[PDB]
Design an enzyme around this catalytic site. Structure first.
Site, PDB file in Angstrom:
ATOM      1  N   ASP A 108       0.825  -1.201   0.000  1.00  0.00           N
ATOM      2  CA  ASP A 108       0.000   0.000   0.000  1.00  0.00           C
ATOM      3  C   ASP A 108       0.866   1.261   0.000  1.00  0.00           C
ATOM      4  O   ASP A 108       1.364   1.686   1.047  1.00  0.00           O
ATOM      5  CB  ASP A 108      -0.906  -0.007   1.241  1.00  0.00           C
ATOM      6  N   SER A 128      -0.726  15.652 -11.969  1.00  0.00           N
ATOM      7  CA  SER A 128      -0.983  15.299 -13.348  1.00  0.00           C
ATOM      8  C   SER A 128      -1.234  16.558 -14.163  1.00  0.00           C
ATOM      9  O   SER A 128      -1.780  17.536 -13.664  1.00  0.00           O
ATOM     10  CB  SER A 128      -2.187  14.354 -13.416  1.00  0.00           C
TER      11      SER A 128
END
Length: 330
Positions: free
Chosen positions: A35, A199
């Site tokens: 994770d 992004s």
């Protein structure tokens, strides 16, 4: 040193991925959920409340000659999906894919929430976010990666998750045969303890690319792609019959649909998520309403590039002095 381990979807939907991990001496192999959005390595154990164990493999520290109680240490964690676990702490030898750390904090669960009990395939988590998020008290502990880093050939690990197929986590090296083209690296903020990046925009299907900054985290422990409501609405508007359902808890779509792809930007590069990756199947057994793999982050407080996005790429988690993230197509 290096390590390399195969990671395998837990079910036919790629709800999560498990990777075998050797703990203790002699080795006890547990299948852990790696994770990159958390920082605790915790396991089902011989200390876990018996009624809360249902099929998981447990770590038994009393059977490990290298286990030592970390005196006074406790841990307690709550995840974004509302699940939780807590317990005490041992140090022991932990190996992943041939890479060995001695003195790793292994957090032994005394209690786990129902969602963990109900998932027989996940024996615990191995956190790969920054150690500043580790919950051990009163002395915070380091992640497996943080402990291994100085010994690694290069201070990196890579995630290469499969779509409906096994994939790979590598530590200490970049497998140049595992991706196509070049890796595009992008800046990371560690201020919130995550692999947080920005992004450069998105496209829906064959549509034009929208340049827009989207700050979010690369999180292998989250199944879906969670993005701003504007972006998500633009995606689902291209699917006939798709709608946001408050009763179901997100966007659903007719199972008869063919889903468009979704592209996200990494600097000037582009990662394309095929439409099929966005299908999470019937909302309930036999339903013709299907659950979408792109969902709104509104009210999460953060955008999350979870498995839906990451499995479309070869992803480098670069833990150099100034961390960065790399993405390649594959």
């Amino acid at each position: 040193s290096t390590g390399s381990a195969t990671t395998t979807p837990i079910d036919s939907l790629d709800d999560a991925y498990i990777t075998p991990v050797q703990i203790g001496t002699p080795a006890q192999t547990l299948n852990l959920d790696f994770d990159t959005g958390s920082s605790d390595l915790w396991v089902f154990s011989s200390e876990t409340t018996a009624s809360e164990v249902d099929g998981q493999t447990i770590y038994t520290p009393s059977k490990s000659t290298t286990a030592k109680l970390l005196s006074g240490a406790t841990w307690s964690i709550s995840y974004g999906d509302g699940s939780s676990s807590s317990g005490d702490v041992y140090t022991d030898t932990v190996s992943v894919g041939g890479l060995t750390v001695t003195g790793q904090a292994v957090e032994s669960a005394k209690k786990v929430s129902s969602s963990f009990t109900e998932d027989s395939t996940i024996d615990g988590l191995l956190g790969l976010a920054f150690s500043t998020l580790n919950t051990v008290s009163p002395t915070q502990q380091k992640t497996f990666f943080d402990n291994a880093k100085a010994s690694l050939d290069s201070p990196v690990f890579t995630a290469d998750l499969g779509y409906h197929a096994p994939g790979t986590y590598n530590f200490g090296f970049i497998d140049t045969t595992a991706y196509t083209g070049s890796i595009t690296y992008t800046a990371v903020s560690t201020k919130q303890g995550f692999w947080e990046w920005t992004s450069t925009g998105y496209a829906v299907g064959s549509g034009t690319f929208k340049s827009t900054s989207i700050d979010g985290i690369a999180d292998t422990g989250t199944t879906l792609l969670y993005l701003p409501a504007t972006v998500v609405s633009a995606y689902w508007a291209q699917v006939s019959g798709a709608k946001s359902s408050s009763s179901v808890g997100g966007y659903v779509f007719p199972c008869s649909a063919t889903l468009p792809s979704f592209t996200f930007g990494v600097g000037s590069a582009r990662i394309v998520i095929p439409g099929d990756y966005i299908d999470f199947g019937p909302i309930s057994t036999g339903s013709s309403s299907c659950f979408g793999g792109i969902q709104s982050s509104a009210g999460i407080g953060i955008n999350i590039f979870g498995d839906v996005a990451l499995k479309a790429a070869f992803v480098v988690f670069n833990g150099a002095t100034t961390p960065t993230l790399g993405f390649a197509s594959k």
